[PDB]
Structure 1
Amino acid sequence: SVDQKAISTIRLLAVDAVAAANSGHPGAPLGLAPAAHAVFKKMRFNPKDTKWINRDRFVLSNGHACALLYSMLVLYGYDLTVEDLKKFRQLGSKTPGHPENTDVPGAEVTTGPLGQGICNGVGIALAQAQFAATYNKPDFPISDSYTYVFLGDGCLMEGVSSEASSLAGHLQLGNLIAFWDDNKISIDGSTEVAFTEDVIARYKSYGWHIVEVSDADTDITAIAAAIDEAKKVTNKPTLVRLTTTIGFGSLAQGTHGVHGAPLKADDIKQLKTKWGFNPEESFAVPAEVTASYNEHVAENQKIQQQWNELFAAYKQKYPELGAELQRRLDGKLPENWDKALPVYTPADAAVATRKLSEIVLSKIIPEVPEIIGGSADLTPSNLTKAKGTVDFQPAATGLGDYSGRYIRYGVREHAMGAIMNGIAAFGANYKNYGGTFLNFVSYAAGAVRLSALSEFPITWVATHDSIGLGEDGPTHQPIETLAHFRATPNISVWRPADGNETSAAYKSAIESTHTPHILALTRQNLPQLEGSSIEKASKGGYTLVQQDKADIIIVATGSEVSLAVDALKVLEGQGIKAGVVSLPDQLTFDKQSEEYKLSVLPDGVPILSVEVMSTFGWSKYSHQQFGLNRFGASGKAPEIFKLFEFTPEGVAERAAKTVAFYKGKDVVSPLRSAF
């Protein structure tokens, strides 16, 4: 049949791609080709419009199997060709060894790090439910799409998927349909060696619906029926158990050897002949298969055409919502939304930057409907919920509604991070955030790094940033955390000092389209600074206190800017003139012009950095660094600052030593380099 020919075509494209690269993973593509064929036949999508907002989404959580995904995209006429398949895993190609959303048309997210994709799918489904609740009206199903996810045993072993699956079941996300590749093989061999849990029983315990397909090597009728069944269960996410043979068809099927290396050439020959293909030919695409797939594309394009007319009619019937929806689909924030950002003067009271963050959110959430977010069980500590908003919950619970804007993530930082990536991936201009203590953003590093690589504008509201949190002690106090994330490409790490800087940090975070943000915020109160503004802080780094005859410039962030200002006064009594630079985001600063940066960190003057955590990175901006390179302590915060000499006098002492160290020396800006 044509369906059988399509499945063979998919299998052999994937195998041939791996063969050409002499690298990659043929096993899961061989095992999952029937399911991929069946799922894509049920999906609504336009290969010529990858951003249609009512498309079904597909996520390959077992991203090593990407030769399968690329084969589907090629067969369906996405902007990816057989010539691209021939360049699988080759430098600069459109077919990298794991799928990257920035590079691969039809890759919704970046997968390969196990466990992430299923969580991303939870986030796509969460966003779809919130979006539909916000916009759908009687006779106007603006959003009614599904989220289909493939995942393997490795994803099921990774704790992040447990977190997201518990939460998805709680949230009754009925438009999520996941498929477990139940092939009983991982890299170390049989799953009997390490993974003997009853997966199905676990998923039932989360409140998921289950469908089992006992012969997923051949039974596409049952896979299609499983999808139909899942669609009828509107209040539970569904897990479809696909019992497959890894490497189905290979001489080496059902073995770990078929997981992650190219097949032998003789094996590929016998695959081709058993399935009616020419063993002398590679990258065959039978015209029957193209025709069948094209029929499905044409039908999907007519569905999108009708959706476009539905949307036009929606804009007439619901003028205000229609304009809002249009704006969001155009990727534009509300005009002058930023006029809602709070502004402060030096006469205003001292405030913790966690509380300043609460106040920002309180003002901007009503102004910008595409902002949603939550906390990982730290809502009253991170201060991440705007008073008067409703939680995102299924209405059946009585605890919220899908139109809600505040997500109770529970104690699930890693899944929160990956779910945020999924919400961003949904599109529609979602600007979403997640709160935890800065030290526990580290629990989510797997996902955070992918926010950066995937270029998603997600935001971490990361409070309790330092030893300033006090008594909870060294298990809670960041040391390495900012260095880690600043050393990751494409992460803005804002550490605002005061009210105006906190508003600049949010302006950046919400306006972002390609760069994730971490906002490092304080437990303790900080004064409003003389010289701060949204305008200046928006440059990432700026001259707070200009001193034309400076003996030294002190560069600082966050809670240490006020400390630097106080140290300036101590230094004046010692006959030393200091300037102060505030550096609320190193990435934003780095992106400014060379001349702007040199106006902040000029030649001819020693520069001392002050920040109460690792000194790593700080030599980019300073000659000497005063930081904290040991773990913290459990005590009242001011006593910890005193212990480590982060006091006006301690900073002044190190500033005076720095001035003395450079006496008789020629000093150029830390911004200078040899190459």
Structure 2
Amino acid sequence: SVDQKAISTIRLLAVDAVAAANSGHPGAPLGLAPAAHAVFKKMRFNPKDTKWINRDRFVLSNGHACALLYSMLVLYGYDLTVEDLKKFRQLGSKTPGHPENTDVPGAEVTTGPLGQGICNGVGIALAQAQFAATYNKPDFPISDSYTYVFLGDGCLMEGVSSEASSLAGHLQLGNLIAFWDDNKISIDGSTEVAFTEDVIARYKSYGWHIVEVSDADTDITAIAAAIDEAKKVTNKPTLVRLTTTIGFGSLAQGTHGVHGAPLKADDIKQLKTKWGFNPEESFAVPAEVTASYNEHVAENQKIQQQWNELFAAYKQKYPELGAELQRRLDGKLPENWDKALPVYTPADAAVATRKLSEIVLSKIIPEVPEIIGGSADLTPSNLTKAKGTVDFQPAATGLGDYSGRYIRYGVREHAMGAIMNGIAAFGANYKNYGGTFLNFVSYAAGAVRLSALSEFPITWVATHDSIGLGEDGPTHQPIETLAHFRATPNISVWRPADGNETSAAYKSAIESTHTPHILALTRQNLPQLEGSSIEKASKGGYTLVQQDKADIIIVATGSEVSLAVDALKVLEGQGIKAGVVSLPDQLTFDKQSEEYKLSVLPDGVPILSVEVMSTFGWSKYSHQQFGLNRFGASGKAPEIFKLFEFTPEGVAERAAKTVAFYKGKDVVSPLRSAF
């Protein structure tokens, strides 16, 4: 049949791509081709409009199987060709060894690190439910799309997928349909060696619906029926168990050797002849397969055409919501939304930056409907919920509604991070955030790094940033955390010192389209600074106190800026004139012009950094660094600062030593380099 020929075409494209690269993973593509064929035939999508907001989404969580995804995209006429498949895993190609949303048309997210994609799918589905609840009206199903996820045993072993699956079951996400490649093989061999749990019983315990397909190597009728069954269960996400043979058809099928290395040439020949293909030919695409797939594309394009007319009619029937939806689909924030950002003067009271963050959210959430967010069981500590908003929950629980804007993630930082990536991936200008203590953002590093690689504008509201949190002690007090994320490409790590800087940090985070943000916020109160503004802090680094005859410049962030200002006064009594630079975001600062940066960190003056955590990275901006390179302590925060000499006198002493160390030396800006 043409369906059988399509499945063989998919299998052989994937195997031929791996063969050409002499690298990659043929086993799962061979096992999952029937399911991929069946799922894509149920999906609504436009290969010529990858951003249609009502498309069904597909996520390959077992990203090593990407030769399968690329084969589907090629066969359906996305902006990816057989010539690209021939360049699988080759430098600069559109077919990298794991899928990257920035590079691959039709890759919704970046997968490969196991466990992430299923969590991203939870986030896409969460966003779809929130979006539909916000915009749909009688006779206007603006959003009614599904989220289809393929995942394997490795994803099911990673704890992040347990977190997201527990939460997705709780949230009754009935438009999520996941498919487990139940092939009983991982890299170390049989799953009997390490993975003997009853997966199905576990998913039932989360509140998922289950469909089992016992012969997923051939039974596309049952796979299609499983999708139909899943669509009838509107209040549970569904897991479809696909019992497959890894490497189906290979001489080496059902073995770990077929997971992750190219097949032997003689194996590929027998695959081709068994399936009616020419063993002398590679990258074959039978025209009947193209015709069949083109028919489905044409039908999907007529569906999108009708959706466009529905949207036009929606704009007439619901003028306000229609204009809001149009603006979001254009990627634009509300005009002058930033006029809602709070502004402070030096006469205003001291406030913790976690509380300043609460106040910002309270002002901007009512003005910017595409902001949603939550906390990992730290809502009253992170201060992440605006009063008067309702939680995102299924209405059946009585605890919220899908139109809600605040997500109770539970104690699930890693899944929160990956779900945030999925919400961003949904599109529609979602600007979403997640709160935890800064030290526990580290639990989510796998997802955070993917936010950076995927270029998603997600935001971590990361409170209790330092030893300033006090009594909870060193298990809670960040030391390495900012260095870790600042060393990751494409992460904006804001550590605002006061009210105006906190507003600048949010302006950056919400305006972002390609850069994730981490906002490092204090437990403890900080004064409003003389010299701060949204305008200056928006530059990432700025001269807070200008001293034309400076003997030293002190560069600081967050809670240490006020400390530097106090140290300047101590230094004046010692006959030393200091300037102060505030550096609320190193990435934003780095992106400014060379001339601007040199106006902040000029030649000819020693520069001392002050920040109560690791000194790593700080030599970019300073000659000497006063930081904290040991773990913290359990006690009242002011006593910890005194213990480590983060006091005006301790800073002044090190500043004076820095001035003395450079006597008789020629000093150039830390911004200078040899290459």
Shift, 1:274, TM fit:
0.1
Offset from partner CA, 1:25-64 (integer Å, 9 cap, x none) = 0000000000000000000000000000000000000000
Offset from partner CA, 1:362-400 (integer Å, 9 cap, x none) = 000000000000000000000000000000000000000
Shift, 1:559, TM fit:
0.1
Q: What CA distance in whole angstroms lies between the structure 2 residues aligned with 1:365 and 1:21?
A: 49
Shift, 1:349, TM fit:
0.1
The equivalent of 1:488 in structure 2 is 488
- 3-state secondary structure, aligned to 1:554: strand
Structure 2 unaligned regions, length at least 5:
none
Q: What CA distance in whole angstroms lies between the structure 2 residues aligned with 1:392 and 1:468?
A: 32
Alignment of 1:392-541 (within 5 A): 392-541=392-541
Shift, 1:118, TM fit:
0.0
Offset from partner CA, 1:210-230 (integer Å, 9 cap, x none) = 000000000000000000000
Shift, 1:584, TM fit:
0.0
Shift, 1:131, TM fit:
0.1
Offset from partner CA, 1:396-450 (integer Å, 9 cap, x none) = 0000000000000000000000000000000000000000000000000000000
Q: What CA distance in whole angstroms lies between the structure 2 residues aligned with 1:67 and 1:663?
A: 62
- 3-state secondary structure, aligned to 1:493: strand
- 3-state secondary structure, aligned to 1:589: helix
- 3-state secondary structure, aligned to 2:456: coil
Shift, 1:73, TM fit:
0.0
Shift, 1:455, TM fit:
0.0
Offset from partner CA, 1:304-339 (integer Å, 9 cap, x none) = 000000000000000000000000000000000000
Shift, 1:518, TM fit:
0.0
- 3-state secondary structure, aligned to 1:571: helix
Offset from partner CA, 1:221-279 (integer Å, 9 cap, x none) = 00000000000000000000000000000000000000000000000000000000000
Shift, 1:202, TM fit:
0.1
Shift, 1:508, TM fit:
0.1
Q: What CA distance in whole angstroms lies between the structure 2 residues aligned with 1:612 and 1:390?
A: 37
Q: What CA distance in whole angstroms lies between the structure 2 residues aligned with 1:320 and 1:9?
A: 48
- 3-state secondary structure, aligned to 1:302: helix
Q: What CA distance in whole angstroms lies between the structure 1 residues aligned with 2:274 and 2:100?
A: 34
- 3-state secondary structure, aligned to 1:446: helix
Q: What CA distance in whole angstroms lies between the structure 2 residues aligned with 1:170 and 1:621?
A: 47
Shift, 1:107, TM fit:
0.0
The equivalent of 1:656 in structure 2 is 656
Q: What CA distance in whole angstroms lies between the structure 1 residues aligned with 2:261 and 2:302?
A: 41
Q: What CA distance in whole angstroms lies between the structure 2 residues aligned with 1:342 and 1:525?
A: 17
Shift, 1:490, TM fit:
0.0
Q: What CA distance in whole angstroms lies between the structure 2 residues aligned with 1:330 and 1:245?
A: 44
Q: What CA distance in whole angstroms lies between the structure 1 residues aligned with 2:313 and 2:551?
A: 68
Offset from partner CA, 1:10-30 (integer Å, 9 cap, x none) = 000000000000000000000
Offset from partner CA, 1:478-497 (integer Å, 9 cap, x none) = 00000000000000000000
Q: What CA distance in whole angstroms lies between the structure 1 residues aligned with 2:446 and 2:662?
A: 42
Q: What CA distance in whole angstroms lies between the structure 1 residues aligned with 2:365 and 2:444?
A: 25
Q: What CA distance in whole angstroms lies between the structure 2 residues aligned with 1:191 and 1:514?
A: 39
Offset from partner CA, 1:609-650 (integer Å, 9 cap, x none) = 000000000000000000000000000000000000000000
The equivalent of 1:162 in structure 2 is 162
Alignment of 1:74-223 (within 5 A): 74-223=74-223
Shift, 1:667, TM fit:
0.1
Q: What CA distance in whole angstroms lies between the structure 2 residues aligned with 1:342 and 1:593?
A: 27
Shift, 1:668, TM fit:
0.1
Q: What CA distance in whole angstroms lies between the structure 2 residues aligned with 1:285 and 1:148?
A: 25
Alignment of 1:182-581 (within 5 A): 182-581=182-581
Offset from partner CA, 1:518-564 (integer Å, 9 cap, x none) = 00000000000000000000000000000000000000000000000
Q: What CA distance in whole angstroms lies between the structure 2 residues aligned with 1:567 and 1:345?
A: 21
Q: Give the aligned CA root-mean-square deviation in angstroms.
A: 0.1
Q: What CA distance in whole angstroms lies between the structure 1 residues aligned with 2:459 and 2:550?
A: 37
Shift, 1:463, TM fit:
0.0
Offset from partner CA, 1:78-98 (integer Å, 9 cap, x none) = 000000000000000000000
Q: What CA distance in whole angstroms lies between the structure 2 residues aligned with 1:220 and 1:354?
A: 53
Shift, 1:591, TM fit:
0.1
Offset from partner CA, 1:166-201 (integer Å, 9 cap, x none) = 000000000000000000000000000000000000
TM-score, structure 1 normalization? 1.00
Q: What CA distance in whole angstroms lies between the structure 2 residues aligned with 1:223 and 1:31?
A: 13
Q: What CA distance in whole angstroms lies between the structure 2 residues aligned with 1:218 and 1:28?
A: 15
Shift, 1:281, TM fit:
0.1
Shift, 1:74, TM fit:
0.0
Structure 1 unaligned regions, length at least 5:
none
Shift, 1:353, TM fit:
0.1
- 3-state secondary structure, aligned to 1:597: helix
Q: What CA distance in whole angstroms lies between the structure 1 residues aligned with 2:555 and 2:261?
A: 51
Number of aligned residues:
675
Shift, 1:342, TM fit:
0.1
Q: What CA distance in whole angstroms lies between the structure 2 residues aligned with 1:644 and 1:330?
A: 51
Shift, 1:607, TM fit:
0.1
Q: What CA distance in whole angstroms lies between the structure 2 residues aligned with 1:46 and 1:575?
A: 70
- 3-state secondary structure, aligned to 1:555: strand
